[PDB]
Amino acid sequence: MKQIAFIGLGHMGAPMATNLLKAGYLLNVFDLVQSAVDGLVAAGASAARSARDAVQGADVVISMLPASQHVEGLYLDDDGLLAHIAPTLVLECSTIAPTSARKIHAAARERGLAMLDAPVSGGTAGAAAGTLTFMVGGDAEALEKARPLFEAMGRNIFHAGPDGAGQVAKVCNNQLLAVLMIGTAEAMALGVANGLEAKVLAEIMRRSSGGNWALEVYNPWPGVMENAPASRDYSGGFMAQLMAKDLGLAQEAAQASASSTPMGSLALSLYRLLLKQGYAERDFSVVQKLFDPTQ
Template sequence: MSKIAFIGLGHMGLPMARNLLKAGHELKVYDLVQEAIDELAAEGAKAARDARDAVAGMQVVITMLPASKHVEGLLLGEGGLLESITTGSLVLECSTIAPDSARKVHAAAKARGIEMLDAPVSGGTAGAAAGTLTFMVGGDAAALEKARPLFAAMGKNIFHAGPDGAGQVAKVCNNQLLAVQMIGTAESMALGVANGLDPTTLAEIMRQSSGGNWVLERYNPWPGVMLNAPASKDYDGGFMAELMAKDLGLAQETAQHSLSSTPMGALALQLYRLLLKQGKGKKDFSVVQKLFTE
């Protein structure tokens, strides 16, 4: 069993930390929101006074924060948390951030003799609660083997994407593709229905044909086609459109870095921003269907 500092107890971090607790690990937890700390303390975690207190004497540090600036702000620079983490420890940085930011943290950790993995997740809050997240991991393969039991307590699929930063690159590539096929699916659904097709019939034909994709398997954006999908619950729950916009923004930042051309990914970002303008940012990202129907 490991001694783990867990920093960042939001919608994703809290259930992830809980799954580690359930697996028998010793956790010391910290968040800016005291209620989140208290909730886990009531379930057996130790409450930290601050981030520095959380990491003191720990072998493993897990961070789950909103964006690049929070990760860099917490870990890097003079007085940054890396200075307080014990040499030889393992940092699992699970936030979704820019690959460049991840690489900066890798370099700073290495300079202090700390092992680090960038390990963004997919699967949403439901996957975090159920312990079925996917981890896309960048960094040293041996470090991944050490961390595997911890990832396994929180998730189901654990991929070694490649060297430092590769986890983040894999995540933005995957989520860009997800956004493109969500919009593509929504367009074809709207086109077919506008031309007389029954939405459930069309969805089933495409699912079994060369148009098949994860969206059609699990997450159809047309209300009523899948009763458990957010589309059938007024687009509540699931993965918020504003988070998809954030990930598509990271994809464009990554594309800028390599001067890659991604016309579909770029257009997807612009369409999600139209949705945000319309006040639909807190709805599930399948709400993009509404762009084409109302």
């Protein structure tokens, strides 16, 4: 088929790259952790020597890395990664500040490459199932070329707008999630503190004007949804530290546009409190513990 280079085999990168393999693409892979690489090699990937080595046969490069100033330093620094090229389609799927995505976008153009920012939403579970949503900034042209690849890794594919718009949509969405999650945790705790059964209150609000994604699919009160992180001591799911990061990127976007974000900013302050408390690697619904005394 097409030769894909996949850089970044972490929590999200590994199952996303594995899904490309199951779809029948040939992948050269690179990650900093050897065992992450070996996992992909066992499933039919070839291992590359490095990021630069990987892209050196590829029709398309897909990155998925954990840090905002890891990603930019990788692509931009004047000694690869963009310096090594074709033109090849680039799909940059990390979550990074929109400003930083535009900066990479422009350098990619200045060089003749079709690039998309296509950050992703959904779980480690979405990544594994291939049901991720992509939020895509860039040229319609480049989105058309990338489509079959997004369809292999994901389900909803939104063209959010021009360069950087995928990151903008992503940071707005995740900031709103944080707000609705704290809103939900505080509402649950208030009701229960005032004599209500958690499951009765959850159902009422879910089905009414308080309704939201957390209440549909991710209730922060232990025992309400038995398959949610709250019912297994907030293990797994989506780390509070990652939510705090995402909120931090949203602040950067707000400074850039002078947008007021009183709920998001407060959400971020509360996430930082969770970090002081040692909860960086708990699922982000652990915010429940701020409000629930009997935990």
